[PDB]
Amino acid sequence: LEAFGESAETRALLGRLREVHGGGAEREVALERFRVIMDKYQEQPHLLDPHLEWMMNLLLDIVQDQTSPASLVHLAFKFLYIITKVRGYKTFLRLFPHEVADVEPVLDLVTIQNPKDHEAWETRYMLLLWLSVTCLIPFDFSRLDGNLLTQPGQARMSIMDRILQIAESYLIVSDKARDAAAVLVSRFITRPDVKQSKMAEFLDWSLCNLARSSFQTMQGVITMDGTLQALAQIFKHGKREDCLPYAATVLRCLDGCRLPESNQTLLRKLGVKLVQRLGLTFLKPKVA
Amino acid sequence: MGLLTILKKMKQKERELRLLMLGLDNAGKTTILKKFNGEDIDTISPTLGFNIKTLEHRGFKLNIWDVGGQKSLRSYWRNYFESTDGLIWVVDSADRQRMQDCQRELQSLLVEERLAGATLLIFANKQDLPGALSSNAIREVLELDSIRSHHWCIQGCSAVTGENLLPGIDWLLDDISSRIFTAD
Amino acid sequence: VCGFSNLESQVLEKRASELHQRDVLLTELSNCTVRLYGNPNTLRLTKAHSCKLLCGPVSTSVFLEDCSDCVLAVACQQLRIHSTKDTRIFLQVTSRAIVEDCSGIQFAPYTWSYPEIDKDFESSGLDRSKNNWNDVDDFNWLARDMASPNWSILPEEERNIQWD
Ligand SMILES: Nc1nc2c(ncn2[C@@H]2O[C@H](COP(=O)(O)OP(=O)(O)O)[C@@H](O)[C@H]2O)c(=O)[nH]1
Ligand SMILES: [Mg+2]
């Protein structure tokens, strides 16, 4: 495979979304057709790098329109997710929008998601990663809110506050959205303002989650894995002088959690991961 | 994970380099990027955030970033100091008043724990300006000679005319490829 | 290098021969009015109080810094402002303009003209059909609905400023 020799077919399939979102048999046919077309490059998806942008923008002008119904928006997000499993998110998210006019349109969309809707999990997954690619903006979340005392009787909640209440709720779910919640906090707490505002709150929440959760209750294990992943990502993508102050309490709690003896392979792997993440916070990076 | 899979992953990572572009505001950080790809520069607007561009050059996939040179956008540069294979600091040659701000910005960036493993490229932009300082003068005001723990270099260029940018990018890519792997 | 430094209550003037692709820097000015007649390469104003600067087309961006009670009127491609207060600019921008640490700012469409002006616009290479003087961005105010309390469009009554 030298190049993508199925551009017209994919373009037609993407264009047919606006007139196949009301069907149940044709929708599945198009999905299965988009899956088999994209799976051909699972061993070498780099060949699709030149196309990524155009297909992404196609799926975006369907989920970024105000006359778009929920059902039509859900198929576009399913397609978007199909392109992020084959290319991967770490490489496909670099092309997503990142303008300051995409901070409130993406957080407001994140606030109309049904957590109990298992059929629309791809929608929530694509929502969290988009919200996380929008936390790179080199500005304070305060400049965006403007004036919070404009609504008398009930003051509006800050953008940073909403994101902290979105991440804590998605970090205890049982679907794939919890993994998208691990990539969000990694780009939410690792910034200046959030670091000074909600770092202590998030740390107390995590230390409470790993102080009350168990490896026996199903939801308890769900709470353990997500918290460990979030802590590992924070210690990996976090500054060493803002983190070293908390490395002493995190390890003291992990030691009392008793992970090595627990009967979970993922929990032990995450625990070893968090232990090695705290270990490098004490030493200075060298350059051999 | 098998040795063969481990090697397939090492190759894909080395095939993709990262170059972080920084510098004071209005130094031509966007004009150089737009000229290096063949786009138009007359319709450029002052960046009010940051930009990313994934291009290919000499068999290397360069994901060049460009962050704002504003003071309120300088407190966020730490959010892009990860997996950075190279750094490109742009300096306005015609700017003689704010010559200490850049010297202070580059010094603070050189003492970064995450940027210790990268190749420094000094692009003295705006050379055609009548009141532009030569490369030798800029090499003495930015305190570049003192640097020893970084493979730095300084070349004058002009983004409007696309001159001396390709040699600098080639030198940066060669100095980045001279090494094997990078740290985590 | 070209421009002015350290002035006080003085009228100045320059022609195109002294502004044909050159860096014009106006530093430390108070109660002084400048009238440029050319197409400078770059334009900068710093530490101006109660001044009145005028200039024709520009080849690059413009940069105001630590000025107040000033009245500008230019036609450039970019215009950046930092720490400005009570300033009325009749700017004609082809791309976009920005206002940082600014307040009590006021804008109007660039309307200044002098003999032999169409020529000055031909050497600069600016597209006269592009004018976005009413689409300035604010670093401090990034709200989606509300308008920034730091810049305002200028009414037609105040746009009539007796230049001469
Ligand atoms: N004369 C001259 N002007 C330039 C050059 N490069 C950029 N400019 C102008 O300088 C201004 C600042 O450009 P910009 O890229 O927006 O600065 P940045 O936003 O910091 O990257 C623009 O109006 C450019 O056209 C150059 O090499 N020579
Ligand atoms: Mg820029």
- The answer to whether the Cα torsion of A85, A89, A94, A98 is positive or negative is positive
Give CA–CA dist B119/B116, Å, rounded.
9
- Ligand 1, atom 13, residue with closest C-alpha: B28
A-B contacts (CB, under 8 Å):
53
Q: Residue A153 has what DSSP assignment?
A: T
Is A139 in contact with C144 (Cβ distance < 8 A)?
A: no
Residue A288 burial (CB < 10 Å; 0-12/13-18/19+)? Answer: exposed
What Å distances lie between residue C134 and A236, C59, C161, CA to CA?
A: 44, 21, 19
Closest CA–CA distance from residue B126 to any residue of chain A (Å): 26
CA trace torsion C70, C72, C78, C79 (10° rounding): 10
**SS3 category, A148:** coil
Shortest CA distance to C36 belongs to which of C80, C65, C88, C76? Answer: C76
Best of C142, C144, C150 to substitute, by most chain A Cβ atoms within 10 angstroms, is: C142
Task: Give residue B163 CA to ligand 1 midpoint distance, Å.
Answer: 14
Q: Are A286 and A245 in contact (CB under 8 A)?
A: no
Burial A61-93 (b: 16+ CB within 10 A, else e): ebbbeeebeeebbbbbbbbbbbbbeebebebbb
Please report which ligand is nearest the Cα atom of B67: 2
The answer to whether the beta carbons of residues B127 and B155 sit under 8 Å apart is: no
> Which residue among C23, C96, C139 places its CB closest to the CB of B70?
C139
Supply the Cα-derived Rg of chain A in whole angstroms: 21
C-alpha dihedral over A135, A136, A142, A148, to 10 degrees? Answer: -30
- Backbone Cα Rg of chain B: 17
Amino acid at position C88, single letter: R
8 Å CB contact of C142 and A100: yes
Other C-beta atoms lying within 10 Å of the C-beta of residue A244: 13
List all residues of chain A from 213 to 232 with a beta carbon under 8 Å from chain B: none
Alpha carbon separation from A85 to A43, A75, A91, B33, B52 (Å, rounded) = 12, 16, 10, 30, 22
For residues C119-158, one letter each, b for 16 or more C-beta atoms within 10 angstroms of the residue's C-beta and e for the rest, the string is ebeeebebeeeeeebeebbbbbbbeeeeebebbeebeeee
Residue C97 is given by DSSP the state: E
SS3 A86: helix
Residues of B in contact with C139 (CB under 8 A): 48, 70, 72-73
Q: Which residues contact C113 (CB under 8 A, 6 or more apart)?
A: none
Distance CA B43, CA A124 (A): 37
Query: Looking at ligand 1, which atom is closest to the CA of residue B69?
Result: 20
Q: Is C16 exposed, middle or buried (0-12, 13-18, 19+ CB in 10 A)?
A: middle
**H-assigned helices in A16-109:** 25-38, 49-63, 70-86, 89-92, 104-109
User: How far is C37 from A67, CA to CA, in rounded Å?
Assistant: 52
Residue B55 near residue B37, CB atoms below 8 Å: yes
Distance CA B90, CA B154 (A): 10
SS percent in chain C: helix, strand, coil, step 5: 5, 45, 50
Paired tokens of B133: 């300082």
Nearest CA in chain A to B80: A136
Yes or no: say if A172 and A227 are a contact pair by the CB < 8 Å rule.
Answer: no
- Chain C CB contacts of B24 below 8 Å: none
Residue C65 host element (H or E): strand C61-68
Measured between alpha carbons, how far is A41 from A39 in angstroms, rounded to an integer? 5
CA distance B44 to chain C (A): 6
The answer to whether B70 is a known catalytic residue is yes
> Which ligand neighbours the alpha carbon of B26 most closely?
1
- H or E element that contains B57: strand B50-57
Of C14, C82, C3, give the one whose Cα is nearest residue C43: C3
Please classify residue A238 by burial: count the beta carbons closer than 10 Å to its beta carbon, then call 0-12 exposed, 13-18 middle and 19+ buried: buried
**Inter-chain touch A100–C143, beta carbons under 8 Å:** no
Helical segments of A147-198, H only = 159-170, 177-185, 192-197
Method of elucidation:
cryo-EM
How far apart, in whole angstroms, are the C-alpha atoms of residue B130 and residue C22?
6
Q: Is B24 annotated as ligand-binding?
A: yes
Q: Ligand 1 pocket by C-beta < 6 Å: which residues?
A: B 25-31, 44, 46-47, 69, 125-126, 128-129, 158-160; C 41, 60-61, 77-78
Distance CA B17, CA A14 (A): 32
Residue in A134, A139, A187 with CA at minimum distance from that of residue C142: A139
How far is residue A20 CA from its own chain's centroid? 28
Q: What is the atom index within ligand 1 of the atom nearest the CA of B159?
A: 27
C64-67: Cβ within 8 A, 24+ apart: none
Q: Which residue type is seen at C143? A: A
Alpha-carbon gap, residue A274 to A246, rounded angstroms:
13
Strand partners, C71: C52, C88
**Structure token digits, residue A38:** 């994209």
CA atoms within 13 A on the CB side of B59: 6
Strand partners, C98: C80, C137
- Judged by DSSP in three states, A254 sits in helix
- Containing H/E element for C82? strand C78-89
Measure the CA–CA gap between B125 and B103, rounded to whole angstroms. Answer: 15
Question: What's the CA gap between C67 and C103, in Å, rounded?
Answer: 11
Resolution in A: 2.2
- CB–CB of A73/A62 below 8 Å? yes
In a mutagenesis test of the A interface, which of B4, B19, B21, B54 is the best target, namely the one with the most A β-carbons within 10 Å?
A: B54
Q: Which residues of B38-64 are buried (b: 16+ CB within 10 A; e: fewer)?
A: eeebeebbbbbbbbbbbeeeeebbbbb
Query: Collapsing DSSP states into helix, strand and coil, what is residue B31?
Result: helix
Contact B88, B69 (CB under 8 A): no
Atom of ligand 1 nearest to the CA of B29: 21
Contacting chains of B (3 CB pairs or more, <8 Å) are A, C
- The active-site residue, picked from B70, B97, B100, B155, is B70
Phi, psi dihedrals of residue B108, rounded to the nearest 5°: -70, -30
Q: Which residues of C73-91 are buried (b: 16+ CB within 10 A; e: fewer)?
A: bbbbbbbbbbebbebbbbb
Cross-sheet strand order for the sheet of B50-57: B50-57, B60-67, B16-23, B86-92, B119-125, B154-156
Q: Which residues on adjacent β-strands are paired with residue C103?
A: C85
Contacts of A225 (CB under 8 A, 6+ apart): A178, A266, A267, A270
Instruction: Please state, as a whole number, how many other Cβ atoms lie within 10 Å of the Cβ of residue B142.
Output: 23
> Which of A143, A147, A150 has the CB atom closest to C142's CB atom?
A143
Separation of alpha carbons B62 and B54, rounded Å: 6
CB atoms inside a 10 Å sphere around CB A255: 12
A101·C144 Cβ contact <8 A? yes
Q: Chain centroid to CA C91: how far?
A: 6
The C-alpha atoms of residue B153 and residue B17 are separated, in whole angstroms, by 19
What residues form DSSP beta bridges with C75? C57
